[PDB]
Amino acid sequence: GSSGSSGKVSPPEDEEAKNLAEKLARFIADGGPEVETIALQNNRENQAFSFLYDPNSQGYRYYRQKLDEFRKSGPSSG
Numbered sequence: 523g524s525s526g527s528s529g530k531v532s533p534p535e536d537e538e539a540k541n542l543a544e545k546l547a548r549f550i551a552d553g554g555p556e557v558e559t560i561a562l563q564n565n566r567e568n569q570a571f572s573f574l575y576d577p578n579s580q581g582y583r584y585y586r587q588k589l590d591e592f593r594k595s596g597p598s599s600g
Contacts, residue, residue, distance in 0.1 A: 534581035543585035551592030
């Protein structure tokens with residue numbers, strides 16, 4: 523239960539991901555603590571949606587960002 527991160531990192535290599543990642547967040551963002559559950563719990567079975575877990579991957583990061591970009595809930599910067 524915390525926020526942070528701010529770009530810096532670079533985008534992924536797999537284009538389909540750059541889209542999937544965004545989309546995911548874009549969607550999970552349209553939802554809340556529920557979508558992040560069904561979307562995740564479900565994504566689990568799905569392999570393509572590995573960028574959600576796979577930390578090593580850069581997509582994961584880029585994905586989260588979009589999540590914050592959309593979510594928009596925390597007047598913090600630093």
